[PDB]
Write a protein that binds this ligand. Sequence first.
Ligand SMILES: CCCCCCCCCCCCCCCCCC(=O)OC[C@H](COP(=O)([O-])OCC(O)COP(=O)([O-])OC[C@@H](COC(=O)CCCCCCCCCCCCCCCCC)OC(=O)CCCCCCCCCCCCCCCCC)OC(=O)CCCCCCCCCCCCCCCCC
Ligand SMILES: CCCCCCCCCCCCCCCCCC(=O)OC[C@H](COP(=O)([O-])OCC(O)COP(=O)([O-])OC[C@@H](COC(=O)CCCCCCCCCCCCCCCCC)OC(=O)CCCCCCCCCCCCCCCCC)OC(=O)CCCCCCCCCCCCCCCCC
Ligand SMILES: CCCCCCCCCCCCCCCCCC(=O)OC[C@H](COP(=O)([O-])OCC(O)COP(=O)([O-])OC[C@@H](COC(=O)CCCCCCCCCCCCCCCCC)OC(=O)CCCCCCCCCCCCCCCCC)OC(=O)CCCCCCCCCCCCCCCCC
Ligand SMILES: CCCCCCCCCCCCCCCCCC(=O)OC[C@H](COP(=O)([O-])OCC(O)COP(=O)([O-])OC[C@@H](COC(=O)CCCCCCCCCCCCCCCCC)OC(=O)CCCCCCCCCCCCCCCCC)OC(=O)CCCCCCCCCCCCCCCCC
Ligand SMILES: CCCCCCCCCCCCCCCCCC(=O)OC[C@H](COP(=O)([O-])OCC(O)COP(=O)([O-])OC[C@@H](COC(=O)CCCCCCCCCCCCCCCCC)OC(=O)CCCCCCCCCCCCCCCCC)OC(=O)CCCCCCCCCCCCCCCCC
Ligand code: HEA
Ligand SMILES: CCCCCCCCCCCCCCCCCC(=O)OC[C@H](COP(=O)([O-])OCC[N+](C)(C)C)OC(=O)CCCCCCCCCCCCCCCCC
Ligand SMILES: [Ca+2]
Ligand SMILES: [Cu+2]
Ligand SMILES: [Zn+2]
Lengths: 55, 133, 114, 196, 101, 81, 147, 106, 139, 229, 89
Amino acid sequence: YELFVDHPDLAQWTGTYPKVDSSHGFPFYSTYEMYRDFQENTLNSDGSFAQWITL
Amino acid sequence: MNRFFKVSSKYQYYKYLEQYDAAFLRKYQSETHWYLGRRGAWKNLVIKYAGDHISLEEEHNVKYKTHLSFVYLSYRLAWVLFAYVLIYNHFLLGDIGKTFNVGEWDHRLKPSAERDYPTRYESLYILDRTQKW
Amino acid sequence: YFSMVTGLSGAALATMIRLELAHPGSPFFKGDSLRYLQVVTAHGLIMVFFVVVPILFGGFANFLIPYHVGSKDVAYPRLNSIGFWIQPCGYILLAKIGFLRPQFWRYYDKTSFS
Amino acid sequence: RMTNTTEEAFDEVSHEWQALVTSNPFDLNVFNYLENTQTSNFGTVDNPLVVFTSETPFRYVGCTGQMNEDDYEGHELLFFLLREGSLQRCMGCGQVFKLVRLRNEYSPEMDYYLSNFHPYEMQEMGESDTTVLMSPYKYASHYEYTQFETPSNMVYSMVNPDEHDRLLVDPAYRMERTKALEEKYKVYTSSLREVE
Amino acid sequence: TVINSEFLTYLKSNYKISFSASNIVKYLSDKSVNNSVILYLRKNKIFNKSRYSRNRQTYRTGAYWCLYVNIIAVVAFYFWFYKFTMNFGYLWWLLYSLILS
Amino acid sequence: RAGPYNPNRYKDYYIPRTLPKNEEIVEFVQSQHSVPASPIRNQRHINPVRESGPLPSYDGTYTMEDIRAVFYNTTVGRDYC
Amino acid sequence: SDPNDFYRDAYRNENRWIDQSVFTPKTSKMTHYDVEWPKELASRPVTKKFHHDKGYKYDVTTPYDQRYNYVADRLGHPEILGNPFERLMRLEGDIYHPNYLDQPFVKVPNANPNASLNFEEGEVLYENTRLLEWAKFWNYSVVVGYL
Amino acid sequence: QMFVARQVVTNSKGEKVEVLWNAQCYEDIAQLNVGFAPVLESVDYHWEIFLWADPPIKPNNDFDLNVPCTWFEYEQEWWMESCIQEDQFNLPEDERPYNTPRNPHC
Amino acid sequence: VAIYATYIALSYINNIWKDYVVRAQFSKDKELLFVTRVSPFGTTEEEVYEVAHLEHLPPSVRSGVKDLSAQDADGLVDVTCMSSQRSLVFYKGDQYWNPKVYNDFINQTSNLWTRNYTGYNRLEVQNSVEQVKIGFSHS
Amino acid sequence: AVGSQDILILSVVFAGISTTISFTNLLITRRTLAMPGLRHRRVLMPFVTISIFLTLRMLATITPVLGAAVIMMAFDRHWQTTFFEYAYGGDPILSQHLFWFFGHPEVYVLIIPTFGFINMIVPHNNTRRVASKHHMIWAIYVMAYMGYLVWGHHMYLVGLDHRSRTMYSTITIMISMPATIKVVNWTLSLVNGALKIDLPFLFSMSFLLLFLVAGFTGMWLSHVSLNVS
Amino acid sequence: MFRWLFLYWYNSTDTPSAIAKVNLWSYINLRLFKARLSSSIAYYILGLNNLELKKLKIFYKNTYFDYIYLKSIPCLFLIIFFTNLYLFL
Ligand SMILES: CCCCCCCCCCCCCCCCCC(=O)OC[C@H](COP(=O)([O-])OCC(O)COP(=O)([O-])OC[C@@H](COC(=O)CCCCCCCCCCCCCCCCC)OC(=O)CCCCCCCCCCCCCCCCC)OC(=O)CCCCCCCCCCCCCCCCC
Ligand SMILES: CCCCCCCCCCCCCCCCCC(=O)OC[C@H](COP(=O)([O-])OCC(O)COP(=O)([O-])OC[C@@H](COC(=O)CCCCCCCCCCCCCCCCC)OC(=O)CCCCCCCCCCCCCCCCC)OC(=O)CCCCCCCCCCCCCCCCC
Ligand SMILES: CCCCCCCCCCCCCCCCCC(=O)OC[C@H](COP(=O)([O-])OCC(O)COP(=O)([O-])OC[C@@H](COC(=O)CCCCCCCCCCCCCCCCC)OC(=O)CCCCCCCCCCCCCCCCC)OC(=O)CCCCCCCCCCCCCCCCC
Ligand SMILES: CCCCCCCCCCCCCCCCCC(=O)OC[C@H](COP(=O)([O-])OCC(O)COP(=O)([O-])OC[C@@H](COC(=O)CCCCCCCCCCCCCCCCC)OC(=O)CCCCCCCCCCCCCCCCC)OC(=O)CCCCCCCCCCCCCCCCC
Ligand SMILES: CCCCCCCCCCCCCCCCCC(=O)OC[C@H](COP(=O)([O-])OCC(O)COP(=O)([O-])OC[C@@H](COC(=O)CCCCCCCCCCCCCCCCC)OC(=O)CCCCCCCCCCCCCCCCC)OC(=O)CCCCCCCCCCCCCCCCC
Ligand code: HEA
Ligand SMILES: CCCCCCCCCCCCCCCCCC(=O)OC[C@H](COP(=O)([O-])OCC[N+](C)(C)C)OC(=O)CCCCCCCCCCCCCCCCC
Ligand SMILES: [Ca+2]
Ligand SMILES: [Cu+2]
Ligand SMILES: [Zn+2]
């Protein structure tokens, strides 16, 4: 959460989701698109077989 | 405050400085308005209008554009040479001897090459040169 | 359109190769092994670097990437135009080697007269 | 480092500075960074998803349905043309879109959409004394550093084209208007202090 | 600045303040206001709806530069490795087209 | 042909051409802060309702079973029924 | 400034109808904005003939005689004319382009000095003639060294 | 090709509003038919997809501001379920055992 | 390389020498100043300036005053033309000045370098600005 | 001798530079002008665009190697640098290594974009979502970034060490799996949908029919003993 | 100066419509720096009458090396004791 609030670009690079909650209704001022390549091209995700072959 | 004292000029327009403070004049004509302070700045508008149009894109300097004669010569030569290349490489490859001329020039250290001669004058002159080290 | 022209050139080179390989004895090149090798190399290079690449990365990419990414134009319209206009020289160079030889004259030309 | 708007700002640069300083929705939508657009709610009839345009009738919109943490996408992307007028709906998921054609004006209707835009980034404005950072470690996380500082004592005021030309050509008029604006700024500050 | 007491009393009577100002200018002192510098923004009709400024829609110099690149490549390669120079006189009418142009 | 055009060669009136008065500015600030400001947009769903109609009933004139019994009869031909 | 105490009263479901209703707040009218600006905006000239494809009803040109005069300085600016060398060379310069010189709202300075100025020589204030000799020496020395 | 359907819906504020269903494309704006007439034919051909350079938008919804699915949400698994059912065999009710002993602890 | 190196060298030498003033003469009415400066080859080149435009401006950085050449009795005085954005450099030595117009010239081209450039004390902080009266003529 | 060989060398360098310009322009276009919401979501973009970008990245990775090899060939031909002359340290097999390191990724670049055409056309005519788009994307990516370690299957018999030979053969045979994944995804994309038969669909079917045999023959070539003959 | 988005957007008097009357736009009033949330996790949960914000603060960020070394002394002594046991074993 500290990383997301202070350095949004690094949070997006690492793939962290926006850690703030907008339940009050006002969207946050530093939201960004999700870069999930690191968490998706992994042995535990849709790239499981590709990562097994690469390993 | 240190107001501007007087303007010893016969041009009544310049007397506007007498109505302001020296600090104000420095702030708005010396610190960040140095390139704009007490200047007409008509050149700014002229250059903006010059840059924001669809005028000729051939540029030589920031002050002058390319010479139209040079531009036209370059364009005509480019078009004609491109047409020659395409036509010769697509239609006139049957007779290479008739379609192309053989020529070259080698280093002056080595003896003059047999093909080193002025084209269109090989029937009128023979070229040779003295080797150099 | 340039890709169509280059593909026709490659098809012509393939036709030359197939006519030479139709039956033994070199019915097409009549013994010019060097010319046949040059034609084969020209065919391969033209098909690889000047048919499929222009079709995919030249026409299809330039036509589709703006649509599929939401851009008014490519980041380098000048470079796109340059890449388009640069192809013909390489295409000709890799396609006309079969015709062009340093020894242009034929075996029955009396070079001793010149 | 900060550009002198009264001397150099024109057309596109002036509009960018207006977007930076006023954050008016019309300019902010035009100059919003392409990489990130503020996340919004799911479109509904009562609370439709608002798509902003800058004096244009239609915009190419894309929809992927209800987003989930596991997948981040509801349905495969479908593109349509969101046009100005009544609300519109997506067939696949029923998401409701509303096209707001912002106008170059300062009105409560436009101010109503202030919260729907990211603040315009300032770090990339002006002139940079560093071309680019040659750092593979932070090529996508750090902007170029600055040797100098950014002044924060600048007050901007909008001007018409003919008035701006008058300010440029006539230094006396420029000084007069500057002094008047300074007096008005003093009055505004005093009024705010009294209200507080 | 100085605000008349009667004017301030009239303002208070006609308006009762119940909300706090959101502008940060309220915190400024007279020194900061004096040190503030005024800048002018040119406001006109907006036609470009993108961050990037208007870009020219034609590259004539680029097209001709590419034509020259092609010509240089072909001619240089043929001359260096084939030693062949195109005989422009064979199709004399294109050379005459250049001369006429 | 319409002819050459340049929109920047004509005056614009997006900003008032006369500066305000000091007393008017003070009174405007007083009045603005003496009354509530216009609301800003909020994106919170308040008592959200189904986008479609009521959920099909367990029993009644039309039930979810009737909908379920339609997937198996699906045809798009070249002629009307 | 307790956030929960503020929010629980500020945002309520039963007030949704009035919470998101846009209105113009009641504020004192300002003559420069609510009186003067509408008048000048409505009094804009209208032209029957305007660029149909790109123009607007209010695209009315300002006459040259009505354009503001240039009074910043008396000294002329011959750069506008275009020097005879450039004219002979046929070079095209933006500074002396007629279209860019034809500004819409302000007249460009006259190429000639204002008639008020008198160029009769007066008396010498400052004079350092040895600067010419020093400059010649340094320039020749640098040229020789560079060669 | 502009709108594939329309409806009139009364919102929570009591006002009736019109909702139009835009024609859609499978991820391909090139295949999308950009027209301004009630015609299926692709008549208009545009050299500049973005005439004014305004970028398109692919909005991303915040999970916090999302709403539970209610646009025929009961149909998401219908396709797969019915595909399985078509080949599934169902025992007749009369032959299916009924009124079996109750579980002791339930 | 040769052509452009020669051109750059000559042009930048001329630019460096342009600032320095060789001769300065008032007009008959003292309304214009004719300035003779160095040319690319070391000859005389004429220019015209307006005395009103001419002004001696303080440095932007207030800690760099001590580094000005004017600190020395035989230094250089940098006079800036605010209209043409040009700089005129004069030797401080009285040998180069006419002693019956120098006083008026320096009292007329030094109007923007005042006491307040160094700051305000607590006796003059209030008077640094003109007080604004609001609502005294009407409620 | 001097002539067509040198012309081909210089034209190969020329085409390498042209490809440099092309992929630079396209990749920067994607990275800087992509619409909001599609900046990083590769899945949402049509498969053809994804394949094109992956192939452009592969070309960027491999082009400098080919350029260096071709430049060395030109230097050996003209200046006689003896880079590939065994007499004084030259390595003739180094030329083959450098060429094939780009050559195999070159054919992979040629093929990868072809899959996108079918992956887009089949859903369009079937009125159905494509089967396992994420898995197909990951399969093409694994093929792309594992084709950099199989360039030696064109050099089995050249005389390289058995260790490298075995590594190349093993990775080459392993490459077959993602192709099978793509084939099964294509097959499953045709089931349980509303088919709209069209000429693009027929072309896609012909493409699948040809690709099956092509890849099968490639896998057979991966057999080392058969590859010898 | 606001910490919470709801408080920031509840009653805004410095909006462009209001500021256009004076036509003065100070650089110190940029929306970029106008509001900024705290670095501690805050999440909303349903209360008895409305949503309420709960803060999840796990650890402090101002501990010093003296405290850290005092806490680490037992680990060092245990390492020494285990090594001595191994040597004597
Ligand atoms: C050694 C050579 C050294 C050379 C030095 C050269 C020095 C000079 C350099 C100058 C050039 C600098 C710029 C380079 C640009 C390259 C091109 C490019 O992409 O630019 C994009 C760039 C911008 O375009 P873009 O499209 O925006 O780029 C998007 C990104 O590139 C994103 O692209 P994307 O979308 O395609 O992303 C793909 C990525 C995205 O996917 C991922 O996120 C990767 C996977 C992450 C999660 C993995 C989890 C696995 C599970 C856990 C671990 C399990 C194991 C057990 C342990 C755990 C147990 C619990 O996935 C992959 O494909 C990576 C493979 C992942 C497999 C992981 C296997 C791990 C096993 C360990 C051993 C193997 C490691 C291999 C490397 C792995 C990757 C780092 O292009 C430009 O700017 C224009 C072109 C510029 C060209 C410049 C000139 C280039 C010259 C290159 C010369 C190279 C010579 C040598 C070649 C041969 C080497 C063998
Ligand atoms: C590499 C050499 C190869 C040679 C091959 C053999 C060629 C021989 C025959 C050549 C002629 C063929 C017939 C065609 C003629 C042109 C018409 C045509 O159909 O072809 C168009 C043909 C191709 O069409 P295009 O280029 O596509 O059309 C676009 C053009 O831009 C056109 O655009 P535009 O219409 O806007 O421009 C029209 C303009 C042509 O466009 C121009 O404006 C180009 C520039 C013209 C003036 C160039 C010379 C003067 C430049 C000033 C600096 C000089 C050097 C410094 C001074 C000291 C000397 C070193 O026409 C003229 O005004 C030409 C009339 C003659 C002018 C003579 C003025 C002499 C002034 C001397 C006093 C001032 C200097 C100070 C002296 C010292 C004082 C102490 O264009 C040309 O040929 C352009 C030039 C043609 C005119 C001749 C220019 C040079 C004349 C020099 C005379 C000697 C001066 C020095 C004497 C010594 C004592 C001072
Ligand atoms: C394609 C057909 C021709 C054009 C379209 C049709 C005509 C339209 C206008 C008609 C009405 C107005 C006429 C007044 C002139 C208006 C235009 C103008 O100023 O002139 C252009 C231009 C002069 O303008 P400029 O001052 O250079 O423009 C500068 C401006 O800044 C403007 O700059 P820019 O950006 O606009 O571009 C300037 C560029 C303008 O851009 C171009 O037009 C570029 C050149 C054309 C495209 C080349 C593509 C490459 C492949 C071409 C292959 C062609 C077929 C094979 C031909 C050779 C073997 C037979 O000018 C050049 O660079 C000219 C280069 C010299 C011409 C080279 C090509 C000659 C062959 C053209 C095709 C002829 C087809 C019919 C005959 C077929 C015989 C079997 O050149 C000429 O006036 C040359 C005219 C003479 C040559 C053409 C006719 C003879 C061709 C030889 C074979 C036939 C012999 C028997 C002829 C019997 C009597 C006809
Ligand atoms: C005598 C011939 C003997 C037999 C051999 C002939 C061999 C011909 C080439 C064979 C291969 C391609 C064949 C394509 C034919 C169909 C073209 C087509 O779709 O119709 C135009 C078509 C217009 O129809 P549309 O788009 O359905 O409807 C729009 C309306 O037309 C309304 O549009 P608008 O409002 O814009 O009105 C203008 C319209 C009205 O005009 C017409 O419709 C008249 C009829 C069509 C005339 C097309 C050519 C005109 C002359 C072009 C010369 C170069 C430009 C210089 C200026 C020329 C000024 C006239 O004109 C055009 O749109 C034509 C534009 C032409 C641009 C050409 C330059 C593009 C760059 C080069 C790309 C291709 C390179 C190939 C070679 C590569 C070698 C490595 O526009 C295009 O698609 C443009 C295609 C451009 C490329 C192909 C044409 C240029 C070929 C140059 C010669 C290459 C020779 C190579 C081998 C030999 C070397 C020595
Ligand atoms: C009155 C005069 C006109 C004045 C008005 C203005 C005129 C404007 C003219 C502008 C000319 C632009 C350039 C044209 C180039 C043409 C090239 C060409 O086709 O040449 C061969 C051409 C025909 O020869 P060919 O035997 O058929 O074929 C060539 C052979 O195959 C092989 O032959 P080669 O082996 O000898 O190779 C030479 C060939 C090139 O052949 C090749 O393909 C071989 C290339 C080898 C290259 C080897 C190295 C590889 C390349 C790259 C190397 C660097 C590395 C790059 C890569 C990077 C690596 C790190 O190119 C040339 O012939 C060179 C050009 C000859 C001189 C022409 C200059 C004319 C005057 C220009 C200035 C005018 C303005 C002056 C001022 C005016 C105002 C005072 O010969 C000619 O030059 C004939 C045409 C001459 C036209 C002259 C101008 C028009 C006027 C004609 C007279 C009409 C009557 C006038 C009456 C006036 C009454 C008042
Ligand atoms: C588009 C071009 C392309 C593609 C995609 C491929 C793909 C593959 N190639 Fe090939 N290859 C070339 C172009 C290509 N190749 C060229 C041009 C040469 C020679 C270059 C020269 O020297 O000039 C070459 C040479 C070549 C060799 C060297 C042969 C030799 O020199 O003796 C080998 C060795 O293993 C090989 C292997 C493979 C493998 C394992 C794949 C894999 O990608 C294939 C994986 C896919 C499958 C294995 C499909 C699985 C099959 C099914 C699902 C269907 C099953 C149905 C039935 C059995 C009925 N290739
Ligand atoms: C011997 C000679 C030595 C060299 C001498 C010359 C020195 C030159 C020094 C200057 C140039 C180099 C500087 C350092 C690098 C700078 C990079 C940079 O800034 O680029 C940003 C550029 C442009 O960035 P941008 O413009 O998008 O964003 C800038 C950042 N913001 C917006 C926040 C301001 O983008 C990239 O290229 C970076 C992303 C791609 C990086 C490569 C990823 C991998 C791609 C292939 C897939 C993986 C395959 C497997 C790999 C592993 C195998 C084992
Ligand atoms: Ca044979
Ligand atoms: Cu291979
Ligand atoms: Zn949807």
